[PDB]
Design a protein around this ligand. Structure first.
Ligand SMILES: CC(C)(CO)NC(=O)c1cccc(Cl)c1
Ligand SMILES: [Zn+2]
Ligand SMILES: [Zn+2]
Ligand SMILES: [Zn+2]
Length: 585
């Protein structure tokens, strides 16, 4: 027994064809089965033909004959159909409202999640459908991983380099850090974990969580977890207050955090507040400073990634009593300078998926662009807070959507929070970029920030751009532009200072060919988000949707504190680069 995701109408029916098996009310369960291919229906039992060796599952072709269900061919003489009269048969057959349109829930229930429009709907549908869609997407996502073949150690060529044999009659996953494997050791009568791993083309390079002497027979699968059901909404009901509520401001604050005193007061005067923090504007400085502004407040710092949480912990280590902080870790190496798993500690740093059930004076959810509506719902379920601050930048990168191929996901569709910031604007905005040369702040202020992002630093005069299409080669899942790496080799021989630069591209395979030919450290834009470097060399590689994504580009070029070279494929963003142009050797 449960709740009709459309009506809430109390009901004993779940769709057996929906991977999430939602509860549907007689009305909604009927409207769902007759308007889609979904015809298997689950109650306290499954509406299937309880006849010996009959394959009728379709609820529309079944009849209750006694207390046992039958199809047309096997039914007793006295039987009523299970699915007739605009209602399918179960408990609470008198309480049932329905809907004027079921169209949205059917699309959510049946879509394969390869179309942008599926994520658009999943973020514009009603709130109860946002949860249903978030479960349905995550389950489809965790299931699709199984469709990938096992990879098995055939030969250990060296250390940090392997030879994989792949399971036949299944595809192979892309070999980039968006796909994290788990190895296994062959035992008597089962298998034990041997740390998580990532792979890249040779043979294959592997960068594993723990070190080992792993040998032939050891195999690797993308570990897929059980998706729980969602209960809490993605945003609580908003409340605007006339005073600061349940928080006691400090009388004496430091000139380090004085630029955020107004914003900290705003945080105390609504239920939840959004903070758009562009690159190097001080998101973690803001987040930690909130604590010194509300000294007595209990604050739970949360984010999706361990990395994001650890950065909050690093910044905390510089400003808050260590004794009053705790890092929550479930039984991957993360921050280990606070007492571990101390829920009742005043300052709790913890990833979303590890959050305990607890209350807090304030909740800070950082790197919000990366959150999915799944995470939003989970936080609201685990954490009851007086205030919720959502810090990120809808102009930066979202969580990768492995299943998406048709259309681009716009920042208004990343999650409920990014939706507010791109529709009604953010509550709070960090308007000064302390990190980047002015050429780069001017470029992205125009590109994605409506000219409201100001440069602290002056022009570096070390920001360069070249228009070179070069020659694009494709491997199994990635792109390579060798002449663009050529041009960078030639730039480095004329400008050897730039050999302290990080290499950035939108493709791990470009990065691999760059590492070998140049010896610069490499990042993908996506792995580069949240990091800074004095000098950045960026090769666009292609003109794709992927390599022209304005949010990727915003992250690529805001990594530089001092100078950047951008080798561009796209005439569009090349022209939007307020950089010294350079001709081709
Ligand atoms: C203006 C400078 C000295 C860079 O600061 N010129 C170059 O180094 C250059 C020019 C065109 C192409 C390549 Cl590969 C390098
Ligand atoms: Zn269904
Ligand atoms: Zn219903
Ligand atoms: Zn039958």
């Amino acid at each position: 027994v449960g709740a009709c995701v459309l009506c809430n109408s109390q009901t004993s029916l779940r769709c057996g064809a929906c991977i999430r098996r939602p509860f549907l009310c007689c009305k909604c369960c009927y409207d769902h089965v007759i308007s889609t291919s979904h015809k298997l229906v689950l109650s306290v039992n499954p509406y299937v033909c309880n006849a010996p060796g009959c394959d009728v599952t379709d609820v529309t072709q079944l009849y209750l004959g006694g207390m046992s269900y039958y199809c047309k061919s096997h039914k007793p003489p006295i039987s009523f159909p299970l699915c007739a009269n605009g209602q399918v048969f179960g408990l609470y057959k008198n309480t049932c409202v329905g809907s004027d349109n079921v169209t949205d829930f059917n699309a959510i229930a049946t879509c394969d999640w390869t179309n942008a429009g599926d994520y658009i709907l999943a973020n514009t549908c009603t709130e109860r459908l946002k949860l249903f869609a978030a479960e349905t997407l995550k389950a489809t996502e965790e299931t699709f991983k199984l469709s990938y073949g096992i990879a098995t150690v055939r030969e250990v060529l060296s250390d940090r380099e392997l030879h994989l044999s792949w399971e036949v009659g299944k595809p192979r996953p892309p070999l980039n850090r968006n796909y994290v494997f788990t190895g296994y050791r062959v035992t008597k009568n089962s298998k034990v974990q041997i740390g998580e791993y990532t792979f890249e083309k040779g043979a294959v390079v592997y960068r594993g969580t723990t070190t080992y002497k792993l040998n032939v027979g050891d195999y690797f699968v993308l570990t897929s977890h059980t998706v729980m059901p969602l209960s809490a909404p993605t945003l609580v009901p908003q409340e605007h207050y006339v005073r600061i509520t349940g928080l006691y401001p400090t009388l004496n604050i430091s000139d380090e955090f004085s630029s955020n005193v107004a914003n900290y007061q705003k945080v105390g005067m609504q239920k939840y507040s959004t903070l758009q923090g562009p690159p190097g504007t001080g998101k973690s400085h803001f987040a930690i400073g909130l604590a010194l502004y509300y000294p007595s407040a209990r604050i739970v710092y949360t984010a999706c990634s361990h990395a994001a949480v650890d950065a909050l912990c690093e910044k905390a280590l510089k400003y808050l009593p260590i004794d009053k902080c705790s890092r929550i870790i479930p039984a991957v190496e993360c921050f280990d300078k606070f007492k571990v798993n101390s829920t009742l500690e005043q300052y709790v740093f913890c990833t979303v998926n590890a959050l305990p059930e607890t209350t807090a004076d304030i909740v800070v959810f950082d790197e919000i662009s990366m959150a999915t509506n799944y995470d939003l719902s989970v936080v609201n379920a685990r954490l009851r807070a007086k205030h919720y601050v959502y810090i990120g930048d809808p102009a930066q990168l979202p969580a990768p959507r492995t299943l998406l191929t048709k259309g681009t996901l716009e920042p208004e569709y990343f999650n409920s929070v990014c939706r507010l910031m791109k529709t009604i604007g953010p509550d709070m905005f960090l308007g000064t970029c302390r990190r980047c040369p002015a050429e780069i702040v001017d470029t992205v202020s125009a590109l994605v920030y409506d000219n409201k992002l100001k440069a602290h630093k002056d022009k570096s005069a070390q920001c360069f751009k070249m228009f070179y299409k070069g020659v694009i080669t494709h491997d199994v899942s990635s792109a390579i532009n060798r002449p663009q790496i050529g041009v960078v080799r030639e730039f480095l021989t004329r400008n050897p200072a730039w050999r302290k630069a990080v290499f950035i591209s939108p493709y791990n395979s470009q990065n691999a060919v760059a590492s070998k030919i140049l010896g610069l450290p490499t990042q993908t834009v996506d792995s580069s988000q949240g990091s800074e470097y004095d000098y950045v060399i960026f090769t666009q590689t292609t003109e794709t949707a992927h390599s022209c994504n304005v949010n990727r580009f915003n992250v690529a070029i805001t990594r530089a504190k001092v100078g950047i070279l951008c080798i561009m494929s796209d005439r569009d963003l090349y022209d939007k680069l307020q950089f010294t142009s350079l001709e081709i050797p």
